[PDB]
Amino acid sequence: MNQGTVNWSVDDIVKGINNVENQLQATQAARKLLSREKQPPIDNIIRAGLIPKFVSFLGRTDCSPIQFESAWALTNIASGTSEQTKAVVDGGAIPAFISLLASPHAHISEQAVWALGNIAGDGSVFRDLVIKYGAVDPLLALLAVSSLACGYLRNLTWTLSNLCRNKNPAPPIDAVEQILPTLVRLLHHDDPEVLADTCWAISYLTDGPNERIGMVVKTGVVPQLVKLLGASELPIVTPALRAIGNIVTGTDEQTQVVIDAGALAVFPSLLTNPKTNIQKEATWTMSNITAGRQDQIQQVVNHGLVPFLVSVLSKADFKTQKEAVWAVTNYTSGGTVEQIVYLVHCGIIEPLMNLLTAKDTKIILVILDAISNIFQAAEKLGETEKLSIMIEECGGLDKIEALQNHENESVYKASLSLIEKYF
Amino acid sequence: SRRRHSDENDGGQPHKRRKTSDANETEDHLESLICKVGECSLESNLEGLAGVLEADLPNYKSKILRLLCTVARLLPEKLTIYTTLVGLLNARNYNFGGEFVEAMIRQLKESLKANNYNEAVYLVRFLSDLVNCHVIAAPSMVAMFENFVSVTQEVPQVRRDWYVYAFLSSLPWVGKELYEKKDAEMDRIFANTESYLKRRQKTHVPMLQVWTADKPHPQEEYLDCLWAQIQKLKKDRWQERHILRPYLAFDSILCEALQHNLPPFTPPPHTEDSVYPMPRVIFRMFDYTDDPEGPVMPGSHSVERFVIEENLHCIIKSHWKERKTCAAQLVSYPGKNKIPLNYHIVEVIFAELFQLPAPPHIDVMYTTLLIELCKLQPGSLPQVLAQATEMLYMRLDTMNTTCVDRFINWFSHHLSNFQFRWSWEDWSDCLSQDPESPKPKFVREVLEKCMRLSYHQRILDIVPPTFSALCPANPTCIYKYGDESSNSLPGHSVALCLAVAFKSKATNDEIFSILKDVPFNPLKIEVFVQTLLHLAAKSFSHSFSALAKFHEVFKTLAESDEGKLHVLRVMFEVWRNHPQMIAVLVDKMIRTQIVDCAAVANWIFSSELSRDFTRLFVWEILHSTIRKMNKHVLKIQKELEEAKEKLARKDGVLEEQIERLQEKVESAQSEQKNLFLVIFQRFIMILTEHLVRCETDGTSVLTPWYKNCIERLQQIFLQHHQIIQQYMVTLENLLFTAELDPHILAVFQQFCALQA
Amino acid sequence: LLKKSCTLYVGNLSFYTTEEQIYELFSKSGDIKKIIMGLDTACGFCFVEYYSRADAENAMRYINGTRLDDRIIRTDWDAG
């Protein structure tokens, strides 16, 4: 005998499922099996032809308890790998869960939303597959007209994010134009666990071409995404920082928006943040900002950000410096001459030189590329030599020459052209 | 220049989640524990539950508070048990206790503005015993008790009454603490409460008392009684011997923990919306002498007695919907020492069944409960119920006809269960008394019920041949035009015609044509009704087939109100031997619009009913005709409040029914008011008559009739207070004015006291 | 249907129990509407249609399981 519906043998559950009070305790037995702490017997249950039986319990319009107990079970089976989640899909379960959304029972539809989120959250296929089954309307409808439950709301915000995540292909554009509006009013909620999955859902959307990003920008969420960057709960900043950092990777006009949102006032704190991973992203977004037009670069300057980049490059670890490097390179690229001087005046020389030893030959090519930029700016000032001297007095000239005898052909071609043209 | 995000990540979040636990199924297991606790030992499970709840606080800090506050307002019969479970959660977590006191206080202020003054007290007495757990500072508790008694100096009286009660009701628990750290202002506060009680007006007492007698047990006002109890307590050095306090087994853990403060409470000001409780009257019929065999019964003034009855009362409230669970939890009642549970469990059930105005639950509820306790306590409880009955009987002389009714009902429906077995000779003292006076009347009305439940001859057997002089007469009809050679009777020949008409199943159109042979026509009805009922006098069904079949015939006759009466008058002259048959016919004649309520009211106060006007069936017909009127008034009001909701082409079609249902309401409410107004008109009439008469003829007023009628007038107010409290203006200006006989005007003034 | 019905199947009744008795008793838990004895002579049961359901519930809690004519009354919910 089993003590209650705890730790039933697989042989028992099958016998109980095949009276409804048996089918209920058995379905519940599978539930407790599929939700145990250690390695759930997901493989064993699927090979017992139980999956199809669980589908019927969903359509139990009369027996509420077994609908819930069953949905719970399947959900913990679609939580496994891609092959296990497939078996559920193959069992025509997708159409069923979308039908369980209608249920007046709070514990059922909420358990159906979750159930759908797992299936869609699998890959791009099952995502679009679920969306094709027109699950967008009901799920969004469950958000029509607070004061709704707290825990429930999260499962929706999560399942929705899984309807935007992953690429190749990207979630149907029409399925986004309709979901976005919802993701906006949600963005103005109060619950962290909800605001978190919100930003994630947004970042997923803004993880593509300028059209996708355009959709998310023309909705007016941007000003809010920057309002959360300063928030305390770290699980809120990361998802929003990505959403923002991904926005700037688009058009120059899509940057002037996030810049006018007040992002250039938060970065100073974002950079000197103890959380190292937040430094990387922060200074990463910095690059795409300085990559834009000139006047925009002139705004990165106005907010005294440059002196920060220097420190982010002269003290911070490597992965944050690699980004601080691009931010400097792009800066010198599109930047103006009177801005280049201001960058040299901030002592960008030595800090930039010290990195001419890294093992990543790519970052090296970039630094040389950034050097040439400063020189071409120095040329139109007739101060060609004056610059060369600085790069020499700080050992830089040696670091550049040490490249002459490097393994990468490009590094030689590049380090040599610099030595020749300006030395 | 611009670069995509390095690394092939996308956040590092779950593509799929797996439900490892649950909230709902958990908050049902937390609720279960917060409930089943106190069913191993007590201090063992409590201590265990203390931590188990804490290990669920990080996630359900706000939920756990929901259950505790709820359990605090729904289960007062466990007060202490939970004041401990909180004291422990306070001994381990401080911020928790504060997040609870702040919760209770808020929850309280809600049920106070929601006119739930009964649940309100439950919480008040909870905060009190929380002082006995170092969870609340003694001062801040007295602070709330300084603004409770402050109300007496503020408005209605019932309002002041409550706060003085909610305060004094708690002292049996938190009195030993209050009068220890602040005994200075304690007596000073008592000096305030003291005066107010004396200042109060005890006008409602005569109406709310079950027994108007003084001996042996007086029925004291629910406050003046409790007060004397608190006095006997203050004198006993605030020492009580019953209340179970588990926290006295946790002196270690508690003393260490700190305390909280009660925010300065200001009672929600009095509005014309607030509905305060009606004054009670402590029911008492037992003292220690009644039970010399068992433990000594806590005094009538003993503060322990205030608790025993209290907890027992609430225990019934919590499980009244289930008799097998009510009686169970009732018998298994705790206590510090041994007490006569039989004599309390019983005195409590009767304390409710006889409570005035109305009981907390349906009358038939207590009938089964007491019967269930006799199965659960075979050789201990029954004897107590038997004596309790004998005692009730001997004290019928000064009882209240209202209560007397429920006693007649319960007793008869009780015997009906146990073969009607009852030593009747026990009540031989009635064989030699005026039939009008209680005891003799009681035995008849009771033997009348036993008959209805069984039958005539059945009762004739069980009662001694000497009691056969009180047995209900052979319930057979009286056919005026029977086999009697009363040939010279008006319309004798015609009555014989109808006789064969019904005996061969006559049509409606037929019976009419025959009635065209009778000299509004009284005799035309005196023949049709007389004839019909007789032919269909075999059983109830045949009679119901009669009123059904020839419904049209009746409708045409009983069209005018005067005609409607004559139908009843005749229908009575035929069944003046079988009161039960009258009740149902008077019932089905109202639900089929043959006659109406306004007609019945008069027919009750008519001269044909002036002989049995004192009998019971006359009122089990009146307080059943009014019920139908109310269930009809509410039926529409409801049906209208569900048509307005539904309103949320079709618009007009629906707004149309709305108007028409509102005029239907205003109409039903009208006839209802007319009925009640007719009642008092007939009462004030027959009462003023009996007064002007006796006060002139030089005789005493207090007659068996005057008493068995004056209470029938009072019973109207009690059993229908909510509604009558709507005609106050009308009544005060038309019916009961200052120019009405004091003895009749008083009965109405006693009514105004219930909620004023 | 039973979740809204106002009629009771009364079983285990004395073969001598009369409609009158049934009436007097069940009238305790509210007003009654209709009563129909069982035949083929008596059969030992009947139906008791109330008006409201609240009255019907009270007959299941109190008038149900009690004794009448030295027999325990057994009442169940009926579908009209």
Residues in chain A after which the backbone breaks (C–N beyond 2.5 Å): 18, 145
- Of the candidates B335, B341, B334, which has an alpha carbon nearest to the alpha carbon of residue B291? B341
Pairing of strands C7-11, C45-50: antiparallel
Residues B108 and B143 in one domain: yes
Question: Nominal resolution in Å?
Answer: 3.5
Residues in chain C after which the backbone breaks (C–N beyond 2.5 Å): 40
What's the rounded Cα separation, in Å, for the pair B368 and B372?
6
Touching subunits of C (3+ CB pairs, under 8 Å) are: B
**What is A1-423's CATH number?**
1.25.10.10
Residues B305 and B228 in one domain: no
Chain A residues whose beta carbon lies within 8 Å of the beta carbon of residue B21: 35
Q: Is the peptide bond before B216 cis (omega within 30 degrees of 0)?
A: yes
Helices (runs of H) and strands (runs of E) counted in chain C:
2, 6
Name the one residue in this structure whose structure tokens are 């629910």: B222
Q: Is the peptide bond before A147 cis (omega within 30 degrees of 0)?
A: yes
Q: CB-based contact (8 Å) between B592 and chain C?
A: no
Q: Of the candidates C21, C63, C70, which has its C-beta nearest B364's C-beta? A: C63
End-to-end CA distance of chain B: 85
What's the rounded Cα separation, in Å, for the pair B662 and A113?
45
Residue C48 dihedral angles phi and psi, to the nearest 5°:
-130, 90
Pairing of strands C32-37, C45-50: antiparallel
- Of the candidates A247, A239, A137, which has an alpha carbon nearest to the alpha carbon of residue A193? A239
Single-letter amino acid, residue A106: A
| B1 contacts A334? CB cut-off 8 A | yes
Residues B276 and B303 in one domain: no
3-class SS at A353? helix
Q: Which residues pair with C77 in a beta bridge?
A: C8
Spatial contact of C76 and C45, defined as CB atoms under 8 Å apart: no
Q: CB-based contact (8 Å) between B620 and chain C?
A: no
Spatial contact of A245 and A281, defined as CB atoms under 8 Å apart: yes
What's the rounded Cα separation, in Å, for the pair A351 and B339?
91
Touching subunits of A (3+ CB pairs, under 8 Å) are: B
Q: Which residues pair with B270 in a beta bridge?
A: none
The full DSSP string for B543-581 is: HHHHHHHTHHHHHHHTTSHHHHHHHHHHHHHHSTT-HHH
Indicate which CATH number applies to the domain containing B169: 1.25.40.180
Spatial contact of B430 and B438, defined as CB atoms under 8 Å apart: no
Single-letter amino acid, residue A139: L
Give, as one character, the DSSP assignment of residue B260.
B
| A79 contacts B10? CB cut-off 8 A | no
3-class SS at A300? helix
Measured at the alpha carbon of residue A372, what is the angle toward residues A369 and A374, in degrees to the nearest 5? 115
C78 in a known ligand binding site: yes
Q: Is the peptide bond before B357 cis (omega within 30 degrees of 0)?
A: yes
- CB neighbour list of residue B470: distance below 8 Å, 6 or more residues apart: B430, B431, B440, B443, B444, B447, B463
Looking at CA atoms only, how far is residue A276 from chain B in angstroms?
A: 15
Residues B466 and B485 in one domain: no
Q: CB-based contact (8 Å) between B321 and chain C?
A: yes
What's the rounded Cα separation, in Å, for the pair B476 and B644?
52
Please name the residue of chain B whose CA is at the shortest distance from the CA of residue A325: B1
Enter the tokens of residue A128.
């679009």
Chain A residues whose beta carbon lies within 8 Å of the beta carbon of residue B19: 35, 72, 75-76, 79, 114
What's the rounded Cα separation, in Å, for the pair A29 and A8?
6
Looking at CA atoms only, how far is residue A207 from chain B in angstroms?
A: 9
Q: Is the dihedral of CA C13, C15, C16, C20 positive or negative?
A: positive
- CB neighbour list of residue A205: distance below 8 Å, 6 or more residues apart: A164, A171, A176, A180, A183, A212, A215, A216
Range of the domain at B657: 476-756
Q: CB-based contact (8 Å) between A320 and chain B?
A: no
Spatial contact of B17 and A120, defined as CB atoms under 8 Å apart: no
Residues in chain B after which the backbone breaks (C–N beyond 2.5 Å): 39, 154, 519, 648
C76 in a known ligand binding site: yes
What's the rounded Cα separation, in Å, for the pair A91 and A111?
18
Chain A residues whose beta carbon lies within 8 Å of the beta carbon of residue B3: 249, 284, 287-288, 326
Chain B residues whose beta carbon lies within 8 Å of the beta carbon of residue A75: 18-19
Residue C36 dihedral angles phi and psi, to the nearest 5°:
-130, 110
Q: CB-based contact (8 Å) between B540 and chain C?
A: yes
Q: Which residues pair with C50 in a beta bridge?
A: C32
What's the rounded Cα separation, in Å, for the pair C48 and C60?
12
Residues B96 and B232 in one domain: yes
Chain C residues whose beta carbon lies within 8 Å of the beta carbon of residue B368: 61-62, 65-66
Q: Which residues pair with C9 in a beta bridge?
A: C47, C76
Measured at the alpha carbon of residue A228, what is the angle toward residues A224 and A233, in degrees to the nearest 5? 155
- Of the candidates A39, A40, A37, A30, which has an alpha carbon nearest to the alpha carbon of residue A10? A30
Please name the residue of chain C whose CA is at the shortest distance from the CA of residue B366: C62
3-class SS at B671? helix
Residue B287 dihedral angles phi and psi, to the nearest 5°:
-135, 175
3-class SS at C76? strand
3-class SS at B397? helix
Single-letter amino acid, residue A222: V
If one counts the domains in chain B, the total is 3
Q: Which residues pair with C32 in a beta bridge?
A: C50
Name the one residue in this structure whose structure tokens are 């090979």: A47
Name the one residue in this structure whose structure tokens are 């977590």: B93
Q: CB-based contact (8 Å) between A203 and chain B?
A: yes
Q: Of the candidates A76, A239, A291, which has its C-beta nearest B19's C-beta? A: A76
3-state DSSP of A177-219: HCCHHHHHHCCCCCCHHHHHHHHHHHHHHCCCCHHHHHHHHCC
Please name the residue of chain A whose CA is at the shortest distance from the CA of residue B21: A35
Spatial contact of C29 and C55, defined as CB atoms under 8 Å apart: yes
| C61 contacts B323? CB cut-off 8 A | yes
Q: DSSP strand E in B99-184: where?
A: none
Residues in chain B: 756
Residues B230 and B353 in one domain: no
Q: Of the candidates B3, B18, B24, which has its C-beta nearest A326's C-beta? A: B3
| A151 contacts B15? CB cut-off 8 A | no
Which CATH number is correct for C1-80, 3.50.50.60, 3.40.50.880, 3.40.190.10, 3.30.70.330? Answer: 3.30.70.330
| B5 contacts A242? CB cut-off 8 A | yes
Looking at CA atoms only, how far is residue B97 from chain A in angstroms?
A: 25
Give the Cβ contact number of residue A238 at 10 Å.
22
H or E stretch at C75: strand C74-77
Sheet with C74-77: list strands edge to edge.
Answer: C32-37, C45-50, C7-11, C74-77
- Of the candidates B346, B358, B365, which has an alpha carbon nearest to the alpha carbon of residue B308? B346
Spatial contact of C5 and C77, defined as CB atoms under 8 Å apart: yes
Any idea where the domains of chain C sit in the sequence? Answer: 1-80
Spatial contact of A242 and A281, defined as CB atoms under 8 Å apart: yes
What's the rounded Cα separation, in Å, for the pair A335 and A323?
17
**What Cα–Cα distance (Å) separates residue C7 from each residue in B41, B334, C66, C78?**
46, 41, 18, 6
- Of the candidates A113, A108, A104, A102, which has an alpha carbon nearest to the alpha carbon of residue A78? A113
What's the rounded Cα separation, in Å, for the pair B156 and B580?
44
Instruction: Name the C residues in 53-72 with CB < 8 Å from any B CB.
Output: 58, 61-63, 65-70
What's the rounded Cα separation, in Å, for the pair B184 and B161?
24
A and C make contact (3+ CB pairs below 8 Å): no
Helices (H), A18-120: 20-33, 42-46, 50-58, 64-75, 82-90, 93-100, 106-120
Spatial contact of A139 and A116, defined as CB atoms under 8 Å apart: yes
Single-letter amino acid, residue A297: I
| B1 contacts A333? CB cut-off 8 A | yes
